[PDB]
Paper text:
We also directly observed conformational and chemical features of mAMCase between pH 4.74 to 5.60 by solving X-ray crystal structures of mAMCase in complex with oligomeric GlcNAcn across this range. Across these different datasets we observed complex ligand density in the active site of mAMCase. Across these different datasets, we observed ligand density for different combinations of occupancy over the −4 to +2 sugar-binding subsites. While modeling chito-oligomers into strong electron density, we observed strong positive difference density between sugar-binding subsites near the C2 N-acetyl and the C6’ alcohol moieties. Using the non-crystallographic symmetry (NCS) “ghost” feature in Coot, we were then able to observe that the positive difference density between ligand subsites in one chain could be explained by the dominant ligand pose observed in another associated crystallographic chain, suggesting the presence of a low-occupancy binding events. This observation led to the discovery that GlcNAcn occupies intermediate subsites, which we label n+0.5, continuing to follow the nomenclature established by Davies et al., in addition to canonical sugar-binding subsites. During ligand refinement, we observed density for both the α- and β−1,4-linked GlcNAc2 anomers in the active site. This unexpected configurational heterogeneity, which is observable because of the high resolution of our datasets (1.30 – 1.95 A), likely formed as a result of equilibration between the two anomers through an oxocarbenium close-ion-pair intermediate. By modeling GlcNAc2 as sequentially overlapping ligands in alternative conformations, we are able to visualize each step in the proposed catalytic cycle of mAMCase. When the −1 subsite is at least 50% occupied, Asp138 prefers the active conformation (up towards Glu140).
One of these proteins, Acidic Mammalian Chitinase (AMCase), is an enzyme known for its ability to function under acidic conditions in the stomach but is also active in tissues with more neutral pHs, such as the lung. AMCase is a member of the glycosyl hydrolase family 18 (GH18), the members of which hydrolyze sugar linkages through a conserved two-step mechanism where the glycosidic oxygen is protonated by an acidic residue and a nucleophile adds into the anomeric carbon leading to elimination of the hydrolyzed product. We found that mAMCase has maximum activity at pH 2.0 with a secondary local maximum at pH 6.5, pointing to a bimodal distribution of activity across pH. Mutations Lys78Gln, Asp82Gly, and Lys160Gln result in the loss of surface-stabilizing salt bridges in hAMCase and may contribute to its reduced activity at more acidic pH. It is likely that the dual pH optima of mAMCase is intrinsic to the catalytic mechanism, where Glu140 can be protonated directly from solution (at low pH) or through proton shuttling across the catalytic triad (at neutral pH).
Author numbering: 22 to 390
The structure:
């Protein structure tokens, strides 16, 4: 099995003990590390942080303590939008400019491949032709990587993609049979499945549907999403299940209504380290739980939730990671990916569960070490 771990190049700016850089990564935890994110300028890949070149070196130097470890550079992300991708794939010339820039960039800085994180072809302003043009991009990149391996006498660069977990986005975005032939791995973002945007409480990454969910609400679980990909053309061995090391926060409209589906208001509270309404890192979750929040096991969906006063949290812990790891193994998937290792209790000083408690759980369950 593979354990793919995202690292974010803005975690360095979090206050105090939230600050995280590649040197804080245990090189033996994962099989693949992915660097989030590169950007794009004039159809070429580029850095986006003043010290990215330094962090690239620190990141790829982790291979000095794990000869099995591979690294990839992710381009895009949620906040990158779509317009630069739409422009880049719109002509063969623009695609060639990009692919050529990617090869030189990855080889120069020590990366083993590229993780395409366009969120998403055919949605969020991207026109309908981008569904097929995304396939064209991936095919041409896969072929260019094969030819560069021949030309440089090195092992081929990998091409992977982070892909939507929402069904309407999947349907608008991906030619799954053809795409799955050319990608090395498919990183399915089976999280952010519920959140304050819905107006009621729900779980970030439930394994199964809630018992009363029907129709499109019954798409919002890991089991449905992964099997959608598998049964619409993707081989299970290439499919990687997404695991969030964060949870989503909600404000209850009435603290006595605190179950799944309870009405909520606003965007949800921010944590002192991540400082973003609506989500908390796992180490921030631990401070909430230790302070006396009521903890509930959502038995039907195999995930925890917790609340205190009018604050409600849908999240994942050691037990839910363990359940979903056993599930993915018994369903013959290729492994797990985590968003993101800097959200684990990497110092071990927030949760009293040791260093990297969530990431270590998957390392053990997937036989990585
Ligand atoms: C592989 C993947 O999950 N990609 C997306 C991530 O971008 C997203 O995380 C968010 O990334 C933004 C930049 O694109 C950051 O500004 C933002 O703080 C961050 N949000 C969180 C909760 O980490 C994750 C998680 O939602 O999933 C995809 O959407
Ligand atoms: C099932 C589904 O499609 N849910 C949507 C959420 O994904 C989405 O949030 C975004 O999810 C991305 C994963 O594909 C993350 O990369 C991204 O960071 C995240 N954005 C936020 C603000 O959390 C929300 C956006 O409103 O809508 C849901 O429909």
């Amino acid at each position: 099995y593979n354990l793919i771990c995202y690292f974010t190049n803005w975690a360095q700016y979090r206050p105090g003990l939230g600050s995280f850089k590649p040197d804080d990564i245990n090189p033996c935890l994962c099989t693949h590390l992915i660097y989030a994110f590169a950007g794009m300028q004039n159809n070429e890949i580029t850095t986006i942080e003043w010290n990215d070149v330094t962090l690239y070196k620190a990141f790829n130097d982790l291979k000095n303590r794990n000869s099995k470890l591979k690294t990839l550079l992710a381009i895009g992300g949620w906040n990158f939008g779509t317009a630069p991708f739409t422009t880049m794939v719109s002509t063969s010339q623009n695609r060639q400019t990009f692919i050529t820039s990617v090869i030189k960039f990855l080889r120069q800085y020590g990366f083993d491949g590229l993780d395409l994180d366009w969120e998403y072809p055919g949605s969020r302003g991207s026109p309908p032709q981008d569904k097929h043009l995304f396939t064209v991009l991936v095919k041409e990149m896969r072929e260019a990587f094969e030819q560069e391996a021949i030309e440089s006498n090195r092992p081929r660069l990998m091409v992977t993609a982070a892909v939507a977990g929402g069904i309407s986005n999947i349907q608008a975005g991906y030619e799954i049979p053809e795409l799955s032939k050319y990608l090395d791995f498919i990183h399915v973002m089976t999280y952010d499945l519920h959140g304050s945007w819905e107006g009621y409480t729900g779980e970030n990454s439930p394994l199964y549907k809630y018992p009363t969910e029907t129709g499109s609400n019954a798409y919002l679980n890991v089991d449905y999403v992964m099997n959608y990909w598998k049964n619409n053309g993707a081989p299970a061995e290439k499919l990687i299940v997404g695991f969030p090391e964060y949870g989503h926060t909600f404000i209850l409209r009435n603290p006595s209504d605190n179950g799944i589906g309870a009405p909520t208001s606003g965007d949800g509270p921010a944590g002192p380290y991540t400082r973003q309404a609506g989500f908390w890192a796992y180490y921030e979750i631990c401070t909430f739980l230790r302070s006396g929040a009521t903890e509930v096991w959502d038995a039907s969906q195999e995930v925890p939730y917790a609340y205190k006063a009018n604050e409600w949290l849908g999240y994942d812990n050691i037990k839910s990671f363990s359940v979903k790891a056993q599930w993915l193994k018994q369903n013959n998937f290729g492994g797990a990916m985590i968003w993101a290792i800097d959200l684990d209790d990497f110092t071990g000083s927030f949760c009293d569960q040791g260093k990297f408690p969530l990431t270590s759980t998957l390392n053990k369950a997937l036989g990585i070490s």
